[PDB]
Amino acid sequence: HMPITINNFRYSDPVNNDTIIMMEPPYCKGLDIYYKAFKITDRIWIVPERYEFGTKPEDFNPPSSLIEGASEYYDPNYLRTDSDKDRFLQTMVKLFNRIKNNVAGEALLDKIINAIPYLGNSYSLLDKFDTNSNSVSFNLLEQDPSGATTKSAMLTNLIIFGPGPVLNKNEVRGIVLRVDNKNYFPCRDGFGSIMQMAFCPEYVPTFDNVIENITSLTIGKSKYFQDPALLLMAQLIAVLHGLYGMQVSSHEIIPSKQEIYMQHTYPISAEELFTFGGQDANLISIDIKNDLYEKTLNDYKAIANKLSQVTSCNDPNIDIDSYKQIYQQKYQFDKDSNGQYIVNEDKFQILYNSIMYGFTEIELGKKFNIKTRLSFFSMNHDPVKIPNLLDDTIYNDTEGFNIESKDLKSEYKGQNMRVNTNAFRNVDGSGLVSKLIGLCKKELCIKIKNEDLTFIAEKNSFSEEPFQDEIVSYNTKNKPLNFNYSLDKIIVDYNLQSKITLPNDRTTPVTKGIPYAPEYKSNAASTIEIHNIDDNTIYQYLYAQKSPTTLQRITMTNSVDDALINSTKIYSYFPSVISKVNQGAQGILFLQWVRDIIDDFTNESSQKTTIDKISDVSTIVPYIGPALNIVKQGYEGNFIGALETTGVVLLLEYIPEITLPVIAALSIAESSTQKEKIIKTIDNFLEKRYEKWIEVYKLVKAKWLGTVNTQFQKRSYQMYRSLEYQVDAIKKIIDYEYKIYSGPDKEQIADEINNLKNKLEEKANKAMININIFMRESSRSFLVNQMINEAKKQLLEFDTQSKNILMQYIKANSKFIGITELKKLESKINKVFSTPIPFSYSKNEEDIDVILKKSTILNLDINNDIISDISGFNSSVITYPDAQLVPGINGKAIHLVNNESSEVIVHKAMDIEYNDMFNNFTVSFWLRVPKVSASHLEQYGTNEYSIISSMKKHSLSIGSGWSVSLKGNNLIWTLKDSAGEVRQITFRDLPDKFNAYLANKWVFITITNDRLSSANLYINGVLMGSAEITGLGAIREDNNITLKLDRCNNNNQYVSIDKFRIFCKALNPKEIEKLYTSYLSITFLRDFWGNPLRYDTEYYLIPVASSSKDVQLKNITDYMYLTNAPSYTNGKLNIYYRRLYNGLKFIIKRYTPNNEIDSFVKSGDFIKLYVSYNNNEHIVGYPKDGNAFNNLDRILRVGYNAPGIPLYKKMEAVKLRDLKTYSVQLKLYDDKNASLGLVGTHNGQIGNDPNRDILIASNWYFNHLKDKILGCDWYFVPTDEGWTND
Ligand SMILES: [Cl-]
Ligand code: NA
Ligand code: NA
Ligand code: NA
């Protein structure tokens, strides 16, 4: 890949007419106003001027107040001098270097460079490329050494200016055109335009980690400043959307103004939420995302027609067909037969999603190791200045602030304001303006920042479209139910794309049109909002907790008013803490007093409870009530009682309407009498019905995010501020009392007093963990119970009505369908409508282990005899009555028999999608199938039956998806696209059933899928099968993943499945190897089948190094030896194997009874080994001075019974080698605990006996534990129903 060039320059560098020009900006078109401009890279210009278009000079002065939004820094003198301009320029170069220095950043820039605006728009002649517009070109003025000045023009993508009036609020806008006295944006209907950014690198926003999950290193909270490179990248994402003509301007989230506690902001564009990414993207309901997608599809279709029937350009020196090739590439159009450009919907979906959803602030932060806010509604604090971005000791172009050599990389410490105090300065107070609200009590007025208020979305933010009638026919198109795109996929795509060399930018001067700059929308206010309240609010309660700045003895009071009035009194709600801190001189009991404070704080702050009536909330912190003045009438002393009788809704200031209007039943308008069209219409209908459940669930979730979750988030913040106040006050009291303390031990105790203050903070941090859990669980619980309950109510009724409509249509068309088809329809439809769609509460590069963990989107585990998804995505798992449990790899596994009740169904969570849009994916699981008898191979060898399937369940057919199937001794992987085309791996198992993978042994399956190459089947980490899958279309699989024997004609067939798991990428051999090994442990020893090894269980012994041999006994008291096992061969069926269950049976017993009551044999357990013979157990050991080949290989004896002769029989069952084999080693000790060696064999001849491999113990093996093949490795084989000798 060709590196992206970033140009270098000083502001004072002479114009060169290449990288440094005199530009006439778009909104100065034809006015002859020029500014020095600098080409940072292809298609991107920097103009180090304040963005003044549409403003007046007073706009640049700090106002007294703001109308709305977060705090704003004004500075009219910013970016005025040449040295300022140079500093700006040098900073922007550095930021562009930072961005390109990471492949994710490189991908973003590459995408922006090549997304050239279309040479025309909706109001062009539609047959001719038009460069004569300020939407696509800017004029420049070029001076010759001779003295001639020519005015020409350049096409560009992006012009970046310095900031407007507000430094700390960056903006991106497209060029507007005035047509028919109306504002038209080509960047909004497919074409794109020049995009203009106003940007400031040095005045950055701040945020905190208050509501974030805990880490394993830190539990305390901090404020962070943002990295300007990420701020820039966030703006570039908006630019990208504009270039693709996909700027949103329709469905905004409008803040309610109903109440005084509600946050004032400009409406939030849907596009801002998409740019930010993560869970907040779901604030836009799926029906709206669909409306936006449909709009852009239409826009792109219209652009395909325009580009096809283009004839010429206003500029004759442009190459129309060369521009026609960038555009084909840009819009991912295909060519017709006639050479017309057409939309391929598959390609559109990939392109659209990648642009709207692909790059996000959250994703980019992770790639760059830059800390971002976790929530779009997370707390913003005052902005700060970064004065020294150009100093590599503070900020460099590979690591930003988070520099590894300063130990600032770990946990974004370089952005942490507690730590990196060198990197930032507080802004000048005279430049900082806020939206303040005064609260006056009837003459104390407190000032609340707009930031401290709660965002509540107004009802008109939310769609009602899912409630409206929906018409189903055969022509009915399936809508996408997921609109997302991984940055991971973009990067992969990028690395697989070749360079695109743009044509010349230069064009003819812009002469047409008027340079209408939209008027600045001033946030200046000359008033502050002021309210009188009767009763104390949350804000009085918080403010009452604030300590004075001036050093004095502080006391605590349980009275808010008392604290509001007195500057030395702090409101508290920890009565024991209060009692203790209010105490006077302790004299010599001072240290114990400080200890006592810490103890009381610990007990009081750690209070937690549960209420049965709120059964899915694990942690209730009772003191929230008195801390924030959350009180219910009649329960003034009883918050827990209040919560018990109200539910979590008690915690909400704004109580939303949660009941929902009726959902119109689906309707059918289909006249066709063709059977194929009727069935299609039914299939369409069933899908549409599913889509309704999803749409409504998503709408409710959107409303919850914008009206409910915001409040619970605020409660978290409020409680954090309260606890912070409490800790601060206590610290000040301890500090004050320590100061005036006189005692002989003052100096000596200084450390402990400091440790105790630290412990205070720790306990407060732990309380905050509880509070965060409380609010998260209360929020989820309100969504999942109260809100989604109402949805279900209406959806159940929708289902009933919709079922009637469908049954009507089938009855009316019954003569065209047929009685056999009609019976299937009936039972199918009854099944479908007798099961609701569940609601999922999804969660949504260190090393390989991390990569395996992060790319897992489903993971079935069994706990407490229950199968569930442990991935975090929270897919619902339904276990049917005859799904059975057996021993697994780690705990228990799933056992499926050939009946209808033997079934496990996974309903994938709402937001997971691992194999659409041609996404790469891997599926893995442990599998155990019985050795198929010769008889069943004859009867059923050609009967292909699935065991796992995602394949879409239509009314009368099975559609797109994947399946695992078996057919005799073949394991089959099938991919099916939405056209019915398939790709398959057929793995033919080994004929030697002792070594075979489908013969009663736990084996690890891994199937990777690379949509641009092939599907690969691995067993035990080894590649076994491959199929090219290139050319296969889109996979649109069922929501359900079904584990079940499907179409199996053998009533006795069964399978076991463990650790079923899906990854959202194609794993590479190293990853699979690591995945495979990660399941293998030495702790529990294994039998031959892969099950845990057990005491008091009969096992046949087989040596690994000689697996065709059985162990035999010469006689009681005597030695053991190897002989060939009887064998089975079947040429017809191409199967053979050494027969099992012949030869000596052994039993393992604990050497001495211990405090374990399970019967699992663990590695390192002391054992006695016995032979079961003549319905007796005979101990295996070595007699003292017994025969031993060359005095080293001790010959083992069975039931040796010679009086006065010590018999050594203490063994250790151990896993010392070969983790991938289900084999065991046995170590024998003498009575002085000296090793007599590992149990193996030695070739020899005793007396008249034939030459034999004789069982021994020998220390020789201990020098060979890394060898590939060792005679000390033993299989333990118990009789098993899965293996019967033929
Ligand atoms: Cl002997
Ligand atoms: Na600057
Ligand atoms: Na995303
Ligand atoms: Na006070």
PDB file of C-alpha atoms and ligand atoms in Angstrom, residues 1183 1185-1187 1197 1200, ligand 1:
ATOM      1  CA  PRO A1183       7.834 -56.825  45.847  1.00  0.00           C
ATOM      2  CA  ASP A1185      14.021 -57.355  45.787  1.00  0.00           C
ATOM      3  CA  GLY A1186      11.701 -58.632  43.034  1.00  0.00           C
ATOM      4  CA  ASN A1187      13.068 -59.471  39.563  1.00  0.00           C
ATOM      5  CA  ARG A1197       3.193 -58.270  40.161  1.00  0.00           C
ATOM      6  CA  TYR A1200       1.715 -60.757  45.240  1.00  0.00           C
TER       7      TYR A1200
HETATM    8 CL    CL B   1      10.855 -63.195  42.438  1.00  0.00          CL
END
